[PDB]
Subunit: 234 residues, 2 copies
């Protein structure tokens, strides 16, 4: 019931072409794995195809899928696309919602909170749609970040924690793992979607937790892992 | 950010049977220096057997028998470890004082008093590991409750509190302090948590999970 081998496996990553998502894909592509990589913005197609090209040279298969990924319909169609090309999904990873198009200085507390409500809704739909297209012994992982909590500095050590726990209970019979990782304060660049000492969480510290949870950490279920180095504020 | 697990000094309390033995075997894949505590003198031939098989993996092993029931004895374990190997890199507390009397002959008050001594020793373990530790060290405690095992009511607790406060305190010394709370295991220590699913989490936290700090990880299969 534990994965002896992670090859021939089907993996969906929402936001899988840059930042945490791309690093997560490279970590999985050490074995002969089937990656469907989602990306939000159509202009990032050359970054996606560059990554596709190097991951194919890692010995992995790569299907790309662009979408705004903002409603249940668009989320459903991501997993439809996944099933169409590789068959039923084994591992689904939600790494990022939509990023900031405005400077943080020019954004208010209400419009940050509204961005959270949208991202929470999409993450709920991601979990729901993953499971309906998923093999038994499968894994769902949401990367829990709050734009409002990052702006005000109030990090906890929460909707996605509630969706994670409730969905793990409901998918117990289907034998699907549902977990979340909540990183500590990160660099401003990631929330624009770009990339003194550092008390900041790096993506290099989050990616191997994702790989672990789907492999040797398979018994962790219903959990939100806070990975922040002990730093709760910035 | 560990480069290797090579040359590292690892202390395991309750290290010769069950989870501790498995933890020891997992770490001994690389060339480690292991200090394996065991509670009972009658388990010495089991200890020497495990020492033999871990030496045949490439690891150096020192055994240490102790009741481990107060701060003085916990201080002595780490003094021993520092004497034999130098400063500790990784300290694991797996165990807790086990049952002599059967479960049926044991009252709730006796289980509660066993948990209290275990909680106190867990506090002392973290405190005394920290005093003998290199920078970038790791302290891990396996959080179980004999009362919760007896009653069947599991939470998803003193050790969580100890873990949190110690990690805040040791922030400048660069020591991570973490706990793992497994679900219902077997009565000798399917919906049960196996030890084979717990020892990889111990190994991961010391390596690629190094950024996890101050946390209690609940590993119960969702049950």
């Amino acid at each position: 019931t534990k994965y002896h081998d992670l090859k021939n496996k089907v993996i969906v990553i929402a936001g899988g072409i840059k930042n945490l998502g791309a690093l997560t894909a490279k970590t999985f592509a050490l074995e002969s794995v089937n990656l469907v990589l989602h990306y939000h913005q159509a202009k990032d197609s050359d970054t996606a195809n560059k990554l596709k090209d190097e991951l194919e040279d890692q010995g992995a298969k790569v299907a790309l899928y662009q979408s705004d990924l903002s409603n249940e319909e668009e989320v459903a169609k991501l997993f439809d696309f996944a099933e169409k090309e590789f068959g039923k999904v084994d591992i689904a990873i939600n790494t990022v919602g939509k990023v900031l198009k405005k400077p943080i200085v020019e954004t208010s507390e209400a419009e940050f909170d509204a961005m959270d409500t949208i991202n929470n809704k999409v993450a709920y739909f991601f979990i729901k749609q993953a499971a309906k297209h998923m093999n038994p012994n499968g894994h769902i992982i949401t990367i829990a970040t709050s734009l409002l909590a990052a702006y005000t500095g109030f990090y906890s050590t929460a909707p996605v924690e509630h969706y994670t726990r409730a969905a793990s209970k409901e998918l117990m019979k289907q034998q699907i793992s549902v977990n979340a990782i909540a990183p500590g304060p990160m660099d401003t660049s990631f929330f624009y979607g770009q990339e003194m000492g550092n008390q900041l969480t790096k993506i290099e510290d989050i990616a191997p937790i994702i790989k672990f949870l789907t492999t040797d950490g398979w018994w962790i279920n219903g959990q939100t892992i806070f990975a922040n180095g002990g730093y709760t504020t910035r």
